[PDB]
Amino acid sequence: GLLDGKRILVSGIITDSSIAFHIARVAQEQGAQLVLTGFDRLRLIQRITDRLPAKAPLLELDVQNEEHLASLAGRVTEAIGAGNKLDGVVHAIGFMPQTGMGINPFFDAPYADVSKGIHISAYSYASMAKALLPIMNPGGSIVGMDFDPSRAMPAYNWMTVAKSALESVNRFVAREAGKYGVRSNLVAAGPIRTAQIQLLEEGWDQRAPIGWNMKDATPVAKTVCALLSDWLPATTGDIIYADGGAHTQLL
Amino acid sequence: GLLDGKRILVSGIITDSSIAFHIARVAQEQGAQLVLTGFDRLRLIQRITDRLPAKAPLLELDVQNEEHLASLAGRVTEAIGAGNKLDGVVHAIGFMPQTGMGINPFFDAPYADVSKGIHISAYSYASMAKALLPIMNPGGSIVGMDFDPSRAMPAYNWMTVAKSALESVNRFVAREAGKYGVRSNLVAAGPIRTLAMSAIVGGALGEEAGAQIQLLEEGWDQRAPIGWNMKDATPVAKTVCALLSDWLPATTGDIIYADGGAHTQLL
Amino acid sequence: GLLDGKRILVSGIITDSSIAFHIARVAQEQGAQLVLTGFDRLRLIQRITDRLPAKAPLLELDVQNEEHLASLAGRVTEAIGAGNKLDGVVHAIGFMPQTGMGINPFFDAPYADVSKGIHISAYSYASMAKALLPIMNPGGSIVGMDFDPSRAMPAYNWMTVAKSALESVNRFVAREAGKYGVRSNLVAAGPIREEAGAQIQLLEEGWDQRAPIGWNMKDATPVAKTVCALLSDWLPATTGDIIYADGGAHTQLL
Amino acid sequence: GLLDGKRILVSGIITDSSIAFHIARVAQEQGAQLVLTGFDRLRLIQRITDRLPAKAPLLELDVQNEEHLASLAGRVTEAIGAGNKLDGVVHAIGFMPQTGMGINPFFDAPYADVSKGIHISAYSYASMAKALLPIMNPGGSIVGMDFDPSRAMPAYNWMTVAKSALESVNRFVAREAGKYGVRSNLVAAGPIEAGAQIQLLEEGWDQRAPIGWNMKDATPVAKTVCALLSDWLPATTGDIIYADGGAHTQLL
Ligand SMILES: CC/C(C)=C1\OC(=O)[C@H](C)[C@H](O)[C@H](Cc2cccnc2)NC(=O)[C@@H](NC(=O)c2ncccc2O)[C@@H](C)OC1=O
Ligand SMILES: CC/C(C)=C1\OC(=O)[C@H](C)[C@H](O)[C@H](Cc2cccnc2)NC(=O)[C@@H](NC(=O)c2ncccc2O)[C@@H](C)OC1=O
Ligand SMILES: CC/C(C)=C1\OC(=O)[C@H](C)[C@H](O)[C@H](Cc2cccnc2)NC(=O)[C@@H](NC(=O)c2ncccc2O)[C@@H](C)OC1=O
Ligand SMILES: CC/C(C)=C1\OC(=O)[C@H](C)[C@H](O)[C@H](Cc2cccnc2)NC(=O)[C@@H](NC(=O)c2ncccc2O)[C@@H](C)OC1=O
DSSP: OTTTTOEEEEOOOOSSSSHHHHHHHHHHHTTOEEEEEEOSOHHHHHHHHTTSSSOOOEEEOOTTOTTTTTSTTHHHHHHHOSSOOEEEEEEOOOOOOTTTSSSSOGGGSOHHHHHHHHIIIIIHHHHHHHHHGGGEEEEEEEEEEEOOOSSBOTTTHHHHHHHHHHHHHHHHHHHHHHTTTOEEEEEEEOOOOOOHHHHHHHHHHHHOTTOOOTTOOHHHHHHHHHHHSTTOTTOOSOEEEESTTGGGBOO | OOSTTOEEEEOOOOOSSSHHHHHHHHHHHTTOEEEEEEOSOHHHHHTTGGGSSSOOOEEEOOTTOHHHHHSTTHHHHHHHOSSOOEEEEEEOOOOOOTTTSSSSOGGGSOHHHHHHHHIIIIIHHHHHHHHHGGGEEEEEEEEEEEOOOSSBOTTTTHHHHHHHHHHHHHHHHHHHHHTTTOEEEEEEEOOOOOHHHHHHHHTTTOHHHHHHHHHHHHHHHHHOTTOOOTTOOHHHHHHHHHHHSSSSTTOOSOEEEESTTGGGBOO | OTTTTOEEEEOOOOOSSSHHHHHHHHHHHTTOEEEEEESSOHHHHHHHGGGSSSOOOEEEOOTTOHHHHHHTTHHHHHHHOSSOOEEEEEEOOOOOOTTTSSSSOGGGSOHHHHHHHHIIIIIHHHHHHHHHGGGEEEEEEEEEEEOOOSSBOTTTHHHHHHHHHHHHHHHHHHHHHHTTTOEEEEEEEOOOOOHHHHHHHHHHHHHHHHOTTOOOTTOOHHHHHHHHHHHSSSOTTOOSOEEEESTTGGGBOO | OTTTTOEEEEOOOOSTTSHHHHHHHHHHHTTOEEEEEEOSOHHHHHHHHHTSSSOOOEEEOOTTOHHHHHHHHHHHHHHHOSSOOEEEEEEOOOOOOTTTSSSSOGGGSOHHHHHHHHIIIIIHHHHHHHHHGGGEEEEEEEEEEEOOOSSBOTTTHHHHHHHHHHHHHHHHHHHHHHTTTOEEEEEEEOOOOOHHHHHHHHHHHHHHOTTOOOTTOOHHHHHHHHHHHSSSSTTOOSOEEEESTTGGGBOO
């Protein structure tokens, strides 16, 4: 097993088609012991986490709640063991209200909404790292999810701003994580099926030399599992691109 | 002149040593008609803008105030003329509370403080563009101030995050500005010795912080092939005035680096 | 004048349509004293340089010839004056044989041809800087021409590789140029005017769509003006960098 | 095994301390069947490759020789089997004469020498891909070695130019490799008046890297190459994976 005898925290599992669900599914197949995180509808989330190959304890974590943080170390240790520590952390949380992304114009999004998105998508990565680093083993790995924000695109708008902030946050999380001997990295994925949206998706498969399947979330789930393993021990504060190679191609 | 017969809005002038003051000073020397922006101390700021080569009207703007942004364009047109429009916009506003940058650890900054910084440093650029684009001429230019956030560095911490957000905002401001035929660009400057920067060197933030900022400034002059003067704010001012002119008409959503070439050098 | 009382060396002025010809035209309008260089057909090049607003001395410069590069500076000083020096240098010589770019597959280009392309497009920038830096004034400027090579595209093939090399060369030229107080920068332009015919069309159409301020493939004056801005004293803190005159297309996905 | 039942071509093995040597060693430990490449001094390479955990056939490949590149595809097939194909390709070839890198000034390197370096370090990657792609399986991987050329540094001079060219070549190799369903990627490694600048670079690298950097250890970069040769990075192409301890993402 690629992740044999590793304790990994996986956050933001809501559906069975999610990359977050597949990361957990692939990790369990590779011999990893998981601890899962639920945002709000925990009863709804428990029905989905039961489709997973092995049993994993579900913990309540509202990334915006301060009390949920700090208690997000004690609650983890009680689930795994008194002397046992975490070997991996998967941050699969990303949100932006519709005012900030979609049909709504860039200028028409109010700050309160874009602030909510930066908190949940970018700040929360530093928050999760602050709470989980004291209970992490040397050689550990924190993985976040990104969508290449280096260039502006239609509809994505303020979520591109939240992603740019995440990239900067990850570089600083790596500095704090390095003193624990833990790696911090981001996984930039291509479009995942969760008029303009069709144009962006079609463009990706054309640009990607090996092509891109918007319906398949296992190639990105495997990329996260490669970063959670000891096969990338010299990679930190970096972005690993699982987009079929589209970002390196103009046409 | 380089900016002859151009109407430019210059924001965030608080001192006489500021890059924002030196933009306005160089612009007036190049034949530009200015409109200046104030935060809270209106009488105190107007008394700092009297040191400028030519006369320029002052206007109240609190980027956090929605009324101040909605009253804009109208208050600008009344200052310049009924049929006259703006040719340039200078966004020289950047803030982050000390919890987010300095000696305070990255993890110890609360969200409310870092949210205040992103609002004032990154979001405000889109807000100023939203309010001023309808009263801007085709071939116009919106200029913002940046500090290279592509790599993490000590003390900067969350201001680096706010700067990364500004870079992304600038790319989207360019899309909206393009519809008016207006350019939107950022100027990435090297370290500038402000009043706060003179204090953190003097030991106001401690011996640990006083070494970090020194190590950064010394390293910048070494990396820059043409060198870098932390005390001189005119080479960055001139770079902004090149972007406000018609000599860079095919540059949009981009970052122009006035750091002595340090960002392209490892050692 | 933006370039008033400045002595600038301009290279690669073969045709009247060239950005190199426009750079010289705009520079002369801004009060600059030029020194021009030709590749081989100096008789035909002199009939082209006669269409420039002001008079400028012609010089023979085969950038592949070592004797021609060693002969530079002396030949330049004799044209301008014994005590006078150069304030600007515009490198506008980019080449790649058709085996390296176009319809011909990437793998089918022989090394001898791509080597010729790297020599003329990338290495020559360092060579021109080596020869002209001792006769350049502090606050001077060396400007090169680029086309964004950060992402692979059809037809450009090995010329994209030669451009990537030029970007790296520019960063090292800046180190040597800094010692003289001279700046070194590149200008990345947008596209300038059946299978190949469709590819280039798809690229040009896409560029005007991506560019928020739009892009005119027929107009070479916005890129010429960008070079002139870099030749002036209005960008004195910019070195080893790439200034993008592409309408903002490189910062836009769609 | 991470590379179980995979046939991988490993080029440029000259010493028992090389990353190329450690890539081959780690791959054999992960269950991979190797085919090795030797430049000229075959008696020296055979001695070094004997120290490897398992047996692997040695093939002669002067990457500058056209006949060697044209006959390579068949010579690999004869070593593995008449019906078998390659699953991985490791390009561990990088050279630049001392005129192009070291104490010698940037301007003083003649073109003939820098041309030799671009041929061996950047062009050869496209040449090796041209020769080996027809005998490669879908889901395959071509891996090259890089040293971050995005910023200029002392001494590395013209080799930084050859590396920038490799990065551009890699993006185009990905286009050709994609047609075969093969991935093409580069691994940017950290360091593995002369001494006064190399020391200042190595010391600075361990300081910048948040997890630190060991200039004496070549196994973390060898493991990174083996991760790219596996099926755990199937959506990565024309990209650069950085095994430098995270130094490239840090200013100080
Ligand atoms: C076209 C504008 C909209 C309305 C969205 O954007 C997309 O669908 C884009 C084109 C992409 O398909 C991305 C692909 C993706 C998926 C997961 C993580 N990073 C990127 N989706 C999200 O960012 C989506 N991200 C996540 O839900 C997310 N999930 C796990 C971890 C981090 C996340 O940002 C979401 C915010 O975006 C959208 O639904
Ligand atoms: C980590 C050390 C501290 C304590 C600071 O950061 C600095 O002093 C950095 C190293 C630089 O000196 C920069 C220089 C600079 C100044 C204005 C625009 N771009 C760059 N300062 C600011 O960005 C400073 N901001 C501005 O003054 C600013 N002014 C006009 C427009 C945008 C700005 O961010 C501010 C963040 O600097 C600091 O207080
Ligand atoms: C792939 C299609 C072909 C067949 C060519 O490429 C183009 O037309 C590309 C897509 C662009 O239109 C660029 C636009 C350009 C032109 C001059 C300087 N920077 C950018 N052309 C060259 O690079 C062209 N270069 C120059 O003329 C050039 N001129 C002065 C200095 C350096 C140069 O590369 C040349 C390589 O372009 C082509 O022949
Ligand atoms: C200090 C200045 C000199 C004189 C050299 O540069 C170094 O030793 C630098 C600082 C690094 O140690 C790098 C690290 C490295 C090692 C292998 C592949 N990419 C990067 N070595 C080379 O590039 C070295 N290249 C390789 O060993 C190499 N090996 C396999 C595949 C590609 C390569 O370039 C070589 C060019 O470096 C040097 O001889």
